Design a protein around this ligand. Structure first.
Ligand SMILES: O=Cc1ccc(O)cc1
Ligand SMILES: [Fe+2]
Length: 525
């Protein structure tokens, strides 16, 4: 059986997200009082903000959109607000310069990921960010982020776009991975390609709790590398260089911004916090591989930098292949690479010209999207909440982003791992943590994540109490599916302006439309 209407032609290209899911969603709006199962913890007081790629227009501009990447599509924010056991939902597109152009034209006008040479001539000198990667609340300002531009600011309640570059950063770019220091309250980050397309320049910054840049430095990367993520320690910002190189000539020729390079080692840039000179910066190297995301970093008793990350032993983004024919064949040969969770040791006192020691295998399982207890951000931490391929319960032939069917709670101090299984015909997305109370022990509280109910065509928010990591306490049940996203964040009420007075949904007026006389009911009848 084939449905007769199903053979009617579509104009849409295949627009994947990171999961490999290819269904456009693109809805903007609200559900008041989202259906829940079980008991929503009363301790939840805040918003789960999630961001997703969801091409608003069919991306047909360049090569009919055949080379669209899962990381490409227009940023849409989903908000799940938890107040007094009740859940509200809002979804809205980031009103990026790109989004607004495409909507107004009813037409795709942008080409390849980070390639202005493949955009429509009229839009080449625009901010080309889809603001689709990560969110942050800092100094009462809510930001949607993507590494190829400054953030766009959004209202935390309506999700209305308010402007571009709220902190007025001098770089062309800002990381989608800044870290909120638990010591200073500073927004610590960077922007690479800080001076334009294929530039080696890196700008480091620290934005204080009052929204002022208090520390900065202009530096360079050893090559124009893909510096997606970083680690924050007491004394350092540690940049993590993926083995991809940008090439302006290739871009001009209508090739991809990035090419994977087997000859490049995993490289780290150590930046002393509040460094007075670029002379203080050191480059460290290991071997070829792709460490996608950090859990976090710290300094041990010996003063050594300790960073946990995912590690893929090859290209986790095969849609950005190598330049050379030889290297292309290597990618094909690698297939689905080995994927682990690993521990790095960078001793800042050692010779940085000497190759770093091999990382320690922490989990011999495909691992992605780690988060921590952010009360321990930029200090010694123990808890990691990791998006996992569940041992003996998962594929493993899948690309690292495409088989994530569980959660792991790792504790360094205890040396224990606990496992949550998403369900049969289910995927689960990045976990976020909310502490039981302000003074609760590290990693004691609630874990939230988006579950794709694949055979149901619905998305859910699972709620797990850390006292029993194997079991859900609650589910937030959407009537539909949303896109499989990238990052999300737990944002507490206390850091959100006007959380006490504003919901996700604007309340209707109190006053009745109808006069008293219009009632069917008479109290005398
Ligand atoms: O998760 C990886 C990622 C990399 C670059 C992007 O622009 C977005 C996401
Ligand atoms: Fe990321």
């Amino acid at each position: 059986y084939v449905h007769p209407t199903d053979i009617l032609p579509s104009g849409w290209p295949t627009a994947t997200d990171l999961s490999g899911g290819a269904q456009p969603r693109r809805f903007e709006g609200t559900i008041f009082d989202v259906m829940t199962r079980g008991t929503i913890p009363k301790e939840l007081h805040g918003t789960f903000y999630r961001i997703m790629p969801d091409y608003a227009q069919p991306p047909t501009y360049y090569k009919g959109g055949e080379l669209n990447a899962p990381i490409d599509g227009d940023g849409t924010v989903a908000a799940f607000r938890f107040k007094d056991g009740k859940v509200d939902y809002r979804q809205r597109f980031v009103e990026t310069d790109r989004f607004k152009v495409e909507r107004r034209a009813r037409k795709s006008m942008y080409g390849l990921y980070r390639n202005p040479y493949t955009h429509h001539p009229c839009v080449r000198q625009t901010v080309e960010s889809t603001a689709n990667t990560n969110v942050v609340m800092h100094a009462g300002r809510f930001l949607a982020m993507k590494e190829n531009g400054n953030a766009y600011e959004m209202d935390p309640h309506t999700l209305k776009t308010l402007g571009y570059n709220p902190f007025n950063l001098p770089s062309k770019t800002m990381t989608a991975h800044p870290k909120q220091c638990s010591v200073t309250g500073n927004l610590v980050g960077f922007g690479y390609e800080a001076k334009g397309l294929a530039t080696k320049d890196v700008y480091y910054f620290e934005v204080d709790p009052s929204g002022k840049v208090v520390r900065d430095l202009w530096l360079e990367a050893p090559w124009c590398a893909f510096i997606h993520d970083c680690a924050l320690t007491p004394n350092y910002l540690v940049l993590m260089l993926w083995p991809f190189e940008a090439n302006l000539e290739r871009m001009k020729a209508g090739g991809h911004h990035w090419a994977y390079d087997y000859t490049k080692p995993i490289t780290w840039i150590t930046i002393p916090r509040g460094a007075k000179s670029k002379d203080e910066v050191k480059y460290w190297h290991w071997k070829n591989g792709m460490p996608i995301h950090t859990a976090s970093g710290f300094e041990d008793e010996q003063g050594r930098i300790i960073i946990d990350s995912s590690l893929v032993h090859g290209n986790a983004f095969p849609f950005f292949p190598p330049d050379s024919d030889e290297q292309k064949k290597k990618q094909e040969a690698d297939g689905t690479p080995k994927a682990q969770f690993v521990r790095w040791t960078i001793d800042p006192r050692k010779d940085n010209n000497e190759q770093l020691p091999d990382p320690e295998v922490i989990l011999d399982t495909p691992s992605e999207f780690p988060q921590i207890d952010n009360r321990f951000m930029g200090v010694e931490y123990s808890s990691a909440f990791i998006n996992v391929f569940v041992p003996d319960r998962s594929d493993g032939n899948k690309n690292v982003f495409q088989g994530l069917n569980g959660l792991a709670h790792y504790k360094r101090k205890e040396g224990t791992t606990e496992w949550y299984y998403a369900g049969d015909n289910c995927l689960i997305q990045e976990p976020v943590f909310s502490p039981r109370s302000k003074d609760a022990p590290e990693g004691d509280g609630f874990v939230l994540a988006i579950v794709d109910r694949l055979d149901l065509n619905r998305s859910e928010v699972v709620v797990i109490d850390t006292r029993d990591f194997t079991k859900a306490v609650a589910a937030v049940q959407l009537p539909f599916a949303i896109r499989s996203g990238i990052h999300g964040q737990w944002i507490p009420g206390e850091v959100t302006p006007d959380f006490e007075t504003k919901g996700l949904v604007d309340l209707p007026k109190e006053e009745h439309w109808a006069p008293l006389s219009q009632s069917p009911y008479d109290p005398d009848a």
